[PDB]
Amino acid sequence: GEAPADRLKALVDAAVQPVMKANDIPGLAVAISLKGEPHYFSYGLASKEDGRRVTPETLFEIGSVSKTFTATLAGYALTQDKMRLDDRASQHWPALQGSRFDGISLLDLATYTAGGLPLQFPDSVQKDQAQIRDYYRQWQPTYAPGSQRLYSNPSIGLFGYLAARSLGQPFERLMEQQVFPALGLEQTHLDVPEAALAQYAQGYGKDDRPLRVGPGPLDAEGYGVKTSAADLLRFVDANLHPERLDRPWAQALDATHRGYYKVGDMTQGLGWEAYDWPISLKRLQAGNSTPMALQPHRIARLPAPQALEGQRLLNKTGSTNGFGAYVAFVPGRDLGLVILANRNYPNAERVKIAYAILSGLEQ
């Protein structure tokens, strides 16, 4: 019958449309993996000015969802014995020898517990090897490594950069030549080809100023990925089924499904952040709130790494000045979703769309 497809469209429309109107989102793509099948729902405009509609192939900036790709490359380095999570950071970049990175682990960098590395590089640090070098050489922790989580692009960016160093190639090259092809991703880019630019959505800010992400230090590692809803769902499906990949990449994905500590309801993995499932919408919003991004929190370390599988929701938000993304999946239910928009709209609203969809699929 047509009832299931009609029901799914009705559910996704009912979840998405009021939130798009309420946050004046010009265009939004949803992709859902359900019972081993992909489903796409596209809304609105990729560009208000030329009238290009969103499709499942439209490219959006995914911001910090890029950190899950960065974690997958690090997973590869780790499970190939090129690095270990307890290595000191300076083991992998001689320029950092003699700095405070002699006493900071790769795990600390990956999980934002190095001791107060900030949300962003200061404006004074441009996309320049020497300026990035000099930034880290001069940095000092605010509190003991391993004690407080402070969400940080310089932190996990350095983790990614060191993972690439451990593999002997530039991060950007490894992603394009190895990681994206291993995951089967042909619509996923750090640097969108000229031939694909027609697919790149416009981003919109205050007063609808047009905003696409510019170059910045460790941009590739932290927030560099542009992808389509269809490709990002393929990446979600790889996370749901790492066993469908060749074993070296399966292991790499598995390494991003291990939790190291808790803050409140959230368990921190490499890239991914996990919750018990089910949990209330308000608790999931709290985990994805502004204070979780901007303020330090004392961690509760786990006695050993915890498998992030079964009845858990793994998620990540991502933002750039013009874009807002959210990905969530439930390993034990073989369920995944992607929500990509061309406005940076509040995380709570992203989570509200996802939760309405997940609730509807349950009920």
Ligand SMILES: *[B@@]([O])(O[C][C][O])C1=[C][C]=[C][C]=[C]1
């Ligand atoms: B990233 O998009 O994280 C915010 C949404 O969780 C991000 C963080 C810091 C700098 C650039 C991008």
Ligand SMILES: [Cl-]
């Ligand atoms: Cl930054």
